[PDB]
């Protein structure tokens, strides 16, 4: 109905699900994938 688009337009979402999982700092995964490959070097 008009109420649905009427509300979901005017509000805002600053807090979702997905960026909870993502960290507020910058933690890249190269270090993570480097040790991922390093344990594979033990394999």
């Amino acid at each position: 109905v008009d109420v649905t688009r009427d509300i979901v337009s005017r509000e805002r979402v600053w807090r979702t699900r997905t960026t909870i999982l993502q960290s507020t700092g910058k933690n890249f995964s190269k270090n993570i994938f480097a040790i991922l490959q390093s344990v594979k070097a033990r394999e």
Binding site: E11, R12, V13, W14, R17, I20, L21
Partner: peptide, 25 residues
């Protein structure tokens, strides 16, 4: 003593639920 205390040791992992921040017009 002879052996340690028994446990079902697991490296579990929890999940946050949906936040539902109060909305911003």
């Amino acid at each position: 003593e002879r052996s340690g205390v028994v446990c079902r040791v697991k490296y579990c992992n929890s999940l946050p639920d949906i936040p539902f921040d109060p909305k911003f017009i």
